Structure formats: structure tokens, C-alpha cells
Amino acid sequence: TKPIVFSGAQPSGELTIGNYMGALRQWVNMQDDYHCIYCIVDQHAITVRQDAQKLRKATLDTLALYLACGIDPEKSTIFVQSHVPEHAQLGWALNCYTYFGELSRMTQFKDKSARYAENINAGLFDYPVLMAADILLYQTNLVPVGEDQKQHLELSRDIAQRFNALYGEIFKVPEPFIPKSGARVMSLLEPTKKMSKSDDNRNNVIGLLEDPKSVVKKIKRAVTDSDEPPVVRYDVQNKAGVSNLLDILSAVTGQSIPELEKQFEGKMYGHLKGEVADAVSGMLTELQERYHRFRNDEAFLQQVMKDGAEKASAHASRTLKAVYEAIGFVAKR
Amino acid sequence: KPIVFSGAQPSGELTIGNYMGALRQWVNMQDDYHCIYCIVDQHAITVRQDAQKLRKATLDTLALYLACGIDPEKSTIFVQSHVPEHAQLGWALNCYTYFGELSRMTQYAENINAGLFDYPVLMAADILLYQTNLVPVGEDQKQHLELSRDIAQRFNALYGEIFKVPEPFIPKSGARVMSLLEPTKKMSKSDDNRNNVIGLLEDPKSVVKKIKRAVTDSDEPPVVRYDVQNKAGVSNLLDILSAVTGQSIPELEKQFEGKMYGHLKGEVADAVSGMLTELQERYHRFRNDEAFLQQVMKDGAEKASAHASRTLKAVYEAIGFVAKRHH
Ligand SMILES: Nc1ncnc2c1ncn2[C@@H]1O[C@H](COP(=O)(O)OC(=O)[C@@H](N)Cc2c[nH]c3ccccc23)[C@@H](O)[C@H]1O
Ligand SMILES: CC(=O)c1ccc2c(c1)CCO2
């Protein structure tokens, strides 16, 4: 049997070109090489308060977007997290093998808490433990994520090793799969802050379902630097904006940074922004064309969810049964 | 009938205090209420422990509740982990519980496991799943019941009347059972010193031995009279004897006129062991009938799941999750 790939994305906010290059692009590319399982993590989404109608719509939007990206339900398992009870069941169990201190030191908890001061909830704090359960349920070998999830992923490894040390080879210890390019795509007007899928200022973001004409305008207004003369060179510390544009271009086109720097020799930020705008506009036009075809076919979305939950449940029930036997529960019959 | 929820820890060896207090009280109200007994194995694992002992203790607890007279045809009795909806609802309610509320629980903190921090949310889920009206709580879990009520009202305020707001079951058992070597302190299963307690599985020789050691007083002549302030020990022995036999304190004070504490102790031991005879007979019979315990757990989980699934579906619909597609 093939090694197992697992990853997920939240049906909240609006997925960006950051989410694509950091995760979804890798998801699509791994489907033949590994046994891939992709999850719409609606139980994680509700750690930030959602409108009920928006949550339901976003779950289905996210499914259609996976399909539009090239996630193929004949090759990969695609499912909604809340459809498989074993996620919450294992999450509770792993809560008992996770330390309070490990969770309080998490960067996401701190950042989200600062942002949502009036809803610092226990789910937000416990976020990483449910994420560990998501991964460990499927005997996962590889987890394709962006740089921002590295810390959560490291806890999942710690939990698996801790549990295995007491009980035997119950879990696989998963490894991160973080790409070379596009692992941390930055905001267009604040290039020292990563691109957010729920940014208050939409001008920071390239949304995957956003009007391409609007995206082209946003790229043209992206902040660069005061260098005289302007030079197109990758340098995160001194040229955050220009570097972010190069990273985006590289990730869309497949061209390396040295190749792009050569291409832009004797050229300035007009040429750079023109190429980024054209590459991104084309990608989004094609993606959105596929998206609407999937999004408006409710019978197909319903079948994909049904088949995916069924396949996921088979894997998940097996791991949970072994966990419950190990920790000492009376088995259900 | 109102729905009553009780969580049973698969860990405590129950005492005569537990039995003649709350358990006997509740055994006789199984047709008055819809009583639910949940053996809380998911709560147990917040404290690291031996796995085979936990499995054993789960079955020990099931057999003992059955032996004490919990009727699986009248009441619902099940193992918590057999009903996935507990964990499912628990996660959901985690997202409507303030971090501050959990840190403000009465209970450095860096090395506690997250389960020990977060278990009040699972407790709330346990209760709210079954549209519970009444929860018998000890003083130690009043804060936890209040959190469950706050969560229920908060969720209901956002989404409609999804949950019943549970109430404490106020009226208490009436049987008084204090510690044998410290009669000011209540006989508790959680006591470190086990000579303070009489467990439900103790044989007659162990009961005689523990009751012989029970503290009395230096009154001369010895006098068997009820006086909690001056004669805590003798009073405790009278309350225990009264709880077992149903004889009043005045009747027993008359029965032991001119008698010494040796006679009192002898009668208490005989009365207690007489009560524990039918109980232990039932226990050892039920505990060693694997098929009977299996059927009780299966039937109980089925009844509980039917109720829990309806609540969870309403919760999930309210939050806005896409409904599972069944095959
Ligand atoms: N600016 C950016 N540049 C590059 N990559 C980025 C950027 N912003 C986000 N990402 C990545 O996108 C993926 C989905 O993010 P979410 O916030 O939906 O979702 C998250 O952040 C996960 N916790 C969801 C999850 C739940 N359970 C799991 C189990 C395995 C893997 C992932 C999960 C992520 O890989 C994230 O790293
Ligand atoms: C019962 C409960 O409170 C709970 C359930 C699932 C879960 C957590 C908590 C933390 C990670 O996943």
C-alpha cells in the first residue's frame, strides 16, 4: 500500500493564492504518488464564530474549489470533518496526552486571541489537539501545509511519539511537506504579514474566487521599495514586497528565482507587476471556470461527500478501535 | 417524566455511605424519572492509569450499579465511550465556552494535561445531550453544573431552544454516614485512609474488624445516646444502624439502654454485613456473566444513542454544518 497523505482547509473566510501555493498546489501534485486524503475542516472553522448560512455555503464552496484545483475524487478521498465522528472521539482522547503548556505557547492561539478578544474560546485553545487527531486517524505519513502550520504539525509528532512510547505502534509519526516556493505568501500592502483568508482589508489579498480584473488592480498597487534604481531581486529583509511578487510569479509559472531575476535584468517594477498580473489573471480565470461547473452541480457535490466520508470512516474507525483498546476502554459491541 | 443524568466514575470502590445515601435513594425513583447512568470512561483518562485496570473497573462499576438495583429495563445505563455523540458535542461546546471560564474553575499549570483543563466542557456535553432536566451533584461539581447551564443558555440565546437548561436535584438522601476513625468527616469513597470506610464488597470479618476500631467516647458509664457534638462516634454508629434496619434513633436508644459500646458495635457489624450479603451475591453473579453485561452495554448504548443523535443533529443544524450523507 502507498504512503498516506492528509491535509485540510477551513470553510471560513475566502481561500487565497497563499492557501493555494502553500497547500492546495501540493495536494493536487501528490495524488498519484501517494494515497491522498483531503478534509474540509468545518469543526476547526467554528473556533472563530461563523454565521450558520455562511458556514454551510463556505463548506460547499471549499469542496468545489478543491475539485476546481484538480483534486480528483477517483484518486483522492475528499470529506467533511464533521461527517466522521472519530475526529472528535480521538481529539478528546489525545487531549489527555497533550500538556496545557504546549497549547498556551502556540502562535496561532495568541494571534487569533488578539484578533477575537471577545471570543477567546476553549476550541481556539484546543485547536492543535483536534488537528493532531485529524492527522493521526489516517496513519498519515506526510502532511502538506504552509509554513504557518509547522508548529501545530510538530505537536502532532510529539503526541504520536508520546502515545506510541506507552502503548506500541498505534500511530505513524507524520512528517511536514512544506514547499520551497509559496510556503508563506505575504500581504500586498503589508508584506511583513502573511496573506490572510479573512483580512479586514481586501486589498491585501488575492482571493481564488475574486474577479480577475480586481486582482490585477490590487497587484498593480502592491507595495515595493524605495530602491534607486529599482531592481528586481529576491531579498525578504530589504525588499519584502518585490520578493513576495517574485515568489507568487515563480509559484504560478514554475520559473526559478534566478531565472526570473535574469528575465528582469534592466527592468523595473512595472515589468514585474505586469507579469505577476498576467500569470495570476490567467490562473484565476481558468480555475473559476472549472469552479462554477462543480459548484452548481449539487448532485455531484453530494456524491463526493458521501463517498469520501465512507472511505474516511473505514480508515478512521480502524485507528480509533486500536487507540481505545490500547488506553483500556471496554470495546463497543 | 423528567430526565435525570448521573455520571459514574469507573474508579471508586463504592462505600455504604454511597449506597445508603444517593444510590438507594435513586434505585427507588426509577419509575418517577427517566434516569440515565453514564459510566464515564472518557473522563477517567484525564488521570494517567493502567489500561487493563480501567477496562476491569468499567465492568466492576457496571456490575455494582446493577447489583445495587439499577434496572436496565427502567433506566438507561451505558459506557460513555460507546456513544460518539459525547465527544462530538463536547468539541462543538468547546467553541462556545470561554477560555476564562475554564481557567476560573476552582480545581505549575504548564504540566497538567489538557483533558484535566477541558473536562468540564465534556461534562456539559454529557448532560445537554439527553435534554436533561435534573442533575444530582455533590458540592465539588456545583461549579461544573453552573458552567453547563451557562453554556446551554448562551447557545439557546444564539440558536433557539436547542437545549434544556438543567437544574440541580436539591433534596438529599437523609442517611448520615460518617468516617469510622473521624466521625466529624463524611464517609467518602475518595478518602485516603480506608479504615474510615466500609466498601460494598467487604466480607464479614473485615466489617467486624473496622467497626471494632470505630471511635466512640470516654463517657462513664458508657451510654448509647445520640449526640453529634459530644458523642460523634456513637452517634455515627447509631445513624449507620438506623440506615440499615429502618429503626428510629429513639427506638435504638431504648434498645441499647444499659448496654456498652461493644454491643452497639456487634449489632452494627451484623446489620451492615447482612445488608452487604444480598448485594455481594448479586454483584459476583452479574460481574461474571459476560453475556449479560455485554447485552446491558449494547442495549444501553442503543437507547442513549437514539436520544443523543437527535440533540446532536439539532446542534449541527443550528451551527450550520452540512448534514452527513449516509450510505
Ligand atoms: N499566506 C499563506 N501562504 C502559504 N500558505 C498558507 C497561507 N495562509 C494559509 N496557508 C496554508 O493554507 C492551508 C489552509 O489554511 P487554513 O487556515 O484553511 O487551515 C489551517 O490552517 C489548518 N490548521 C487546517 C487543518 C486542520 N486539520 C488539519 C490537519 C492537517 C493539515 C491541516 C489541517 C494550510 O496548510 C496553511 O498553512
Ligand atoms: C469532549 C470535548 O470537550 C472535546 C472533544 C473533542 C476534542 C476536544 C475536546 C479537544 C480536541 O478534540
Numbering used by the authors:
A (entry chain B): 2 to 334
B (entry chain A): 3 to 109, 117 to 336
Question: What does the published report state?
Answer:
Tryptophanyl-tRNA synthetase (TrpRS) links tryptophan to tRNATrp, thereby playing an indispensable role in protein translation. Unlike most class I aminoacyl-tRNA synthetases (AARSs), TrpRS functions as a homodimer. Each EcTrpRS subunit consists of a Rossmann fold aminoacylation domain (AD, residues 1–85, 140–183 and 299–334), a connecting polypeptide 1 domain [CP1, residues 86–139; CP1 was combined with AD in some previous studies (37)] and a C-terminal α-helical domain (CTD, residues 184–298). Therefore, TrpRS is considered an attractive drug target for developing bacterial-selective inhibitors for fighting microbial infections.
In this study, seven fragments were observed to bind to an unprecedented pocket buried at the dimeric interface between the CP1 domains of two EcTrpRS subunits. The CP1 domains of both subunits contribute equal residues (Ala89, Gly92, Trp93, Asn96, Asp127, Val130 and Leu131) to build this pocket, and this pocket is generally symmetric in shape and shows both hydrophobic and hydrophilic characteristics. The binding modes of the other six fragments in this pocket are similar to chlorzoxazone, particularly for the hydrophobic interactions contributed by Trp93 from both subunits. Remarkably, although this pocket is generally symmetric in shape, however, all the seven fragments bind to it in an asymmetric way that the electron density maps clearly show a single orientation for each fragment in the pocket. Probably, the binding of TrpAMP caused a slight conformational difference in the CP1 domain between subOpen and subClosed. Site-directed mutations were performed on these pocket-surrounding residues, and EcTrpRS variants with D127A, V130A or L131A mutations were successfully expressed and purified. TSA results showed that the fragments caused significantly smaller ΔTm values to these EcTrpRS variants than to wild-type EcTrpRS, confirming the specific binding of the fragments to this pocket. However, sequence alignments revealed that the CP1 sequences in forming this buried pocket are vary widely between bacterial and eukaryotic TrpRSs. Thus, these fragment hits are likely specific to bacterial TrpRS.
